Design an enzyme around this catalytic site. Structure first.
Site, PDB file in Angstrom:
ATOM      1  N   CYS A 245       4.675   0.929   9.596  1.00 10.34           N
ATOM      2  CA  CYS A 245       4.403  -0.262   8.701  1.00 10.34           C
ATOM      3  C   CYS A 245       5.740  -0.732   7.995  1.00 10.34           C
ATOM      4  CB  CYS A 245       3.387   0.108   7.612  1.00 10.34           C
ATOM      5  SG  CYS A 245       1.749   0.629   8.245  1.00 10.34           S
TER       6      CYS A 245
ATOM      7  N   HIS B 248       0.815  -1.221   0.000  1.00  9.56           N
ATOM      8  CA  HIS B 248       0.000   0.000   0.000  1.00  9.56           C
ATOM      9  C   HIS B 248       0.845   1.265   0.000  1.00  9.56           C
ATOM     10  CE1 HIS B 248       0.138  -0.930   4.392  1.00  9.56           C
ATOM     11  NE2 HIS B 248       0.260   0.381   4.519  1.00  9.56           N
TER      12      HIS B 248
ATOM     13  N   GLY C 276       3.748   5.461  10.589  1.00  8.57           N
ATOM     14  CA  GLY C 276       5.129   5.336  10.148  1.00  8.57           C
ATOM     15  C   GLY C 276       5.756   3.999  10.510  1.00  8.57           C
TER      16      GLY C 276
HETATM   17  C1  LIG Z   1       1.331   2.276   7.498  1.00  4.57           C
HETATM   18  O1  LIG Z   1       1.220   2.229   6.082  1.00  4.57           O
HETATM   19  C2  LIG Z   1       2.356   3.391   7.870  1.00  4.57           C
HETATM   20  O2  LIG Z   1       3.077   3.335   8.890  1.00  4.57           O
HETATM   21  N1  LIG Z   1       2.370   4.428   6.976  1.00  4.57           N
HETATM   22  C3  LIG Z   1       3.222   5.589   7.119  1.00  4.57           C
HETATM   23  C4  LIG Z   1       2.671   6.777   7.855  1.00  4.57           C
HETATM   24  C5  LIG Z   1       2.873   6.837   6.352  1.00  4.57           C
HETATM   25  C6  LIG Z   1      -0.042   2.657   8.119  1.00  4.57           C
HETATM   26  C7  LIG Z   1       0.001   2.835   9.634  1.00  4.57           C
HETATM   27  C8  LIG Z   1      -1.233   3.543  10.202  1.00  4.57           C
HETATM   28  C9  LIG Z   1      -1.190   3.739  11.715  1.00  4.57           C
HETATM   29  N2  LIG Z   1      -1.190   1.700   7.794  1.00  4.57           N
HETATM   30  C10 LIG Z   1      -2.230   2.065   7.041  1.00  4.57           C
HETATM   31  O3  LIG Z   1      -2.297   3.240   6.584  1.00  4.57           O
HETATM   32  C11 LIG Z   1      -3.376   1.052   6.721  1.00  4.57           C
HETATM   33  C12 LIG Z   1      -3.503   0.972   5.200  1.00  4.57           C
HETATM   34  C13 LIG Z   1      -3.436  -0.473   4.631  1.00  4.57           C
HETATM   35  C14 LIG Z   1      -4.881  -0.981   4.617  1.00  4.57           C
HETATM   36  C15 LIG Z   1      -5.782   0.252   4.472  1.00  4.57           C
HETATM   37  C16 LIG Z   1      -4.938   1.486   4.834  1.00  4.57           C
HETATM   38  C17 LIG Z   1      -5.444   2.199   6.086  1.00  4.57           C
HETATM   39  N3  LIG Z   1      -4.588   1.735   7.207  1.00  4.57           N
HETATM   40  C18 LIG Z   1      -4.797   1.843   8.568  1.00  4.57           C
HETATM   41  O4  LIG Z   1      -3.958   1.352   9.383  1.00  4.57           O
HETATM   42  C19 LIG Z   1      -6.061   2.618   9.075  1.00  4.57           C
HETATM   43  N4  LIG Z   1      -7.043   1.627   9.509  1.00  4.57           N
HETATM   44  C20 LIG Z   1      -8.088   1.279   8.728  1.00  4.57           C
HETATM   45  O5  LIG Z   1      -8.288   1.785   7.613  1.00  4.57           O
HETATM   46  C21 LIG Z   1      -9.060   0.221   9.274  1.00  4.57           C
HETATM   47  N5  LIG Z   1     -10.447   0.674   9.086  1.00  4.57           N
HETATM   48  C22 LIG Z   1     -11.516   0.577   9.892  1.00  4.57           C
HETATM   49  O6  LIG Z   1     -11.533   0.035  10.994  1.00  4.57           O
HETATM   50  C23 LIG Z   1     -12.762   1.154   9.252  1.00  4.57           C
HETATM   51  C24 LIG Z   1     -12.833   1.406   7.850  1.00  4.57           C
HETATM   52  N6  LIG Z   1     -13.948   1.926   7.273  1.00  4.57           N
HETATM   53  C25 LIG Z   1     -15.035   2.173   8.098  1.00  4.57           C
HETATM   54  C26 LIG Z   1     -14.966   1.936   9.495  1.00  4.57           C
HETATM   55  N7  LIG Z   1     -13.833   1.404  10.070  1.00  4.57           N
HETATM   56  C27 LIG Z   1      -8.958  -1.072   8.434  1.00  4.57           C
HETATM   57  C28 LIG Z   1      -9.906  -2.179   9.003  1.00  4.57           C
HETATM   58  C29 LIG Z   1      -9.846  -3.449   8.170  1.00  4.57           C
HETATM   59  C30 LIG Z   1      -8.438  -3.982   8.118  1.00  4.57           C
HETATM   60  C31 LIG Z   1      -7.480  -2.933   7.557  1.00  4.57           C
HETATM   61  C32 LIG Z   1      -7.528  -1.647   8.408  1.00  4.57           C
HETATM   62  C33 LIG Z   1      -5.733   3.711  10.163  1.00  4.57           C
HETATM   63  C34 LIG Z   1      -7.024   4.432  10.545  1.00  4.57           C
HETATM   64  C35 LIG Z   1      -4.716   4.697   9.547  1.00  4.57           C
HETATM   65  C36 LIG Z   1      -5.119   3.095  11.446  1.00  4.57           C
END
Ligand SMILES: *[C@](O)(C(=O)NC1CC1)[C@H](CCC)NC(=O)[C@@H]1[C@H]2CCC[C@H]2CN1C(=O)[C@@H](NC(=O)[C@@H](NC(=O)c1cnccn1)C1CCCCC1)C(C)(C)C
Ligand SMILES: *[C@](O)(C(=O)NC1CC1)[C@H](CCC)NC(=O)[C@@H]1[C@H]2CCC[C@H]2CN1C(=O)[C@@H](NC(=O)[C@@H](NC(=O)c1cnccn1)C1CCCCC1)C(C)(C)C
Lengths: 306, 306
Positions: A145, A41, A143
């Protein structure tokens, strides 16, 4: 004596961490030989997260769209492929610090060490267990991942986890090093429920042996039980059912202490139905399930690594 | 999010560990530059432990009585001096892996990472706190002495502890890197009592902030208190008295959450007198005191190291 949540020394892994960038996204990658592995991603923008078509997205990306760093050293991407949910970046420079490794996929209940990183730089190390519902209760921030989980077998580092995301409940999910998620999760921003979680019974019994090894023996009793009769009580308290295999894996600890596994199950049975009554075991007021039988033997026998 | 007992990456320390032998005794040493530091009781026989005269014992020892190894590599001892309870062995080969370090003496309540080793080989890493009575609740077996505790400040490793012994209660004691014991202990096999232990109040408050940062806020209440009034309740439950300094060190966490330190003390006050009533905080059923305010900020802000 003593008993702690011990992690593996992270020296060998620290030298494989790198910083990966694509567009405005920067995360960590794992640099082994001439390949850098990272969550796929990394190529997505916030708008793509909803329903990404990774194949099409990847097709529109060229090797120079990926900035990879190892401290000051800038690696050069020669090619990019995608394996499941992991992105593989072929590089011009091989990693001299590449240790003797291998990729393994652990099972629920097994434990591993996590090297949390940010911008390709290590932040800390901690031990945790793969929960029965395939999530982990880690400690990760934005940050994080690309950070990996691993184990060590003398001189061989076994990589078993790469961090990808966080659930609203606060728990974490990721894949193995071949890109396959642990659990029913997919990498897209949609509501995705993790199953019901349960207590890792075999681990709890291992911890109880550890306590006995460490002189905490109050919970021991003269009663005994059968695997069937134990399991009936266990399932009532949301504990994983105990199998003959589990019993066999606990053999070494049973040999060392002279306490049969079923005798131990009988003590656990009582604790579940009567509670700890204001007492603690190994300093805890709750039954700990994130220590495998092996973790207990290793820590109580002093097994070291090359 | 999430919160774990996180240790510092141990890469930089792993390359300084060596095996030291003298007579039939083998333990670990710390190899920095052209010196190997190790516990001085390495020269004693079981008979000498009762009432050793280290000066006389050392006088009867020659450089070749000390076998030092770094894997296969055998170092050559050129001289031997004694500084307090630590033995310094000058060697012919300097350590190329010598990181940018320094020796510091921590205070009760401060935390550090311990790299447990055996035969000069790392076994695991874990975090722990120097207790108010100057002991530590570690996890060490026979062969563990010479293992060190350390912290990291970007690119500088600060060594603050060397393991020497274990008390019958199961706790551990050792010195700083200048050879001075922490606590009233002396290195001889005699009964030596460790003072009464107390709970590190400032650490507990830090952990409470951590919980709030992580969404666990049930224990919060609208009442408030004074430092004097809090301390009166605290001392009744064997908690260290809280000082204005403590309050100031908790400032950053107070700023980030918008909760005054005295407001937090008021919640802790209630918890002490009323208990947790079957609830948990950050997964624990007991109040945790082995996380300093800095540990909480570091883990909640993602501070990394060179
Ligand atoms: C990681 O890529 C990173 O360290 N990136 C650096 C900062 C630039 C990062 C770490 C976030 C704390 N992870 C993500 O961004 C993942 C990626 C991969 C899958 C989708 C996107 C979003 N994401 C998240 O960790 C988010 N979490 C979600 O999107 C969860 N969503 C919900 O619970 C939800 C969604 N729609 C409606 C209602 N609830 C989903 C849930 C299903 C499993 C995958 C994660 C955040 C909010 C950033 C933690
Ligand atoms: C360490 O040198 C090591 O790893 N050696 C490798 C195996 C060859 C070793 C680790 C033991 C687990 N430490 C010791 O041997 C220290 C040294 C240094 C000070 C005296 C000796 C004995 N020792 C111990 O750790 C022992 N503990 C004690 O002797 C404690 N004694 C009592 O509690 C006591 C004494 N007399 C009567 C009644 N009780 C003393 C208490 C006072 C502070 C120092 C330790 C053992 C029993 C080996 C743990």
């Amino acid at each position: 004596s003593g008993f702690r949540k011990m992690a593996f020394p992270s020296g060998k892994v620290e030298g494989c961490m790198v910083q990966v960038t694509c567009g405005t996204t920067t995360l960590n990658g794992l640099w082994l030989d001439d390949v850098v592995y990272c969550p796929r991603h990394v190529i997505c923008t916030s708008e793509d997260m909803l329903n990404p078509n990774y194949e099409d997205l990847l097709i529109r990306k060229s090797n120079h769209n990926f900035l990879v760093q190892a401290g000051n050293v800038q690696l050069r991407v020669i090619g990019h492929s995608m394996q499941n949910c992991v992105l593989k970046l072929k590089v011009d420079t091989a990693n001299p610090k590449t240790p003797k490794y291998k990729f393994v996929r652990i099972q629920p209940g097994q434990t591993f060490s996590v090297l949390a990183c940010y911008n390709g730089s290590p932040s800390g190390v901690y031990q945790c267990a793969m929960r029965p519902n395939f999530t982990i209760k880690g400690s990760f921030l934005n940050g994080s991942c690309g950070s990996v989980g691993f184990n060590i077998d003398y001189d061989c580092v076994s990589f078993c986890y790469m961090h990808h995301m966080e659930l609203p409940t606060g728990v974490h999910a990721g894949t193995d090093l071949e890109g396959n998620f642990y659990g029913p999760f997919v990498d897209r921003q949609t509501a995705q429920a993790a199953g019901t979680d349960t207590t890792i019974t075999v681990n709890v019994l291992a911890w109880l042996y550890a306590a006995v090894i460490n002189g905490d023996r109050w919970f021991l009793n003269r009663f005994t039980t059968t695997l069937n009769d134990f399991n009936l009580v266990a399932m009532k308290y949301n504990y994983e059912p105990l199998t003959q295999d589990h019993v066999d894996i606990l053999g070494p600890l049973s040999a060392q202490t002279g306490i049969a596994v079923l005798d131990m199950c009988a003590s656990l049975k009582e604790l579940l139905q009567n509670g700890m009554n204001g007492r603690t075991i190994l300093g805890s007021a709750l039954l700990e399930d994130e220590f495998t039988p092996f973790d207990v033997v290793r820590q109580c026998s002093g097994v070291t690594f090359q």
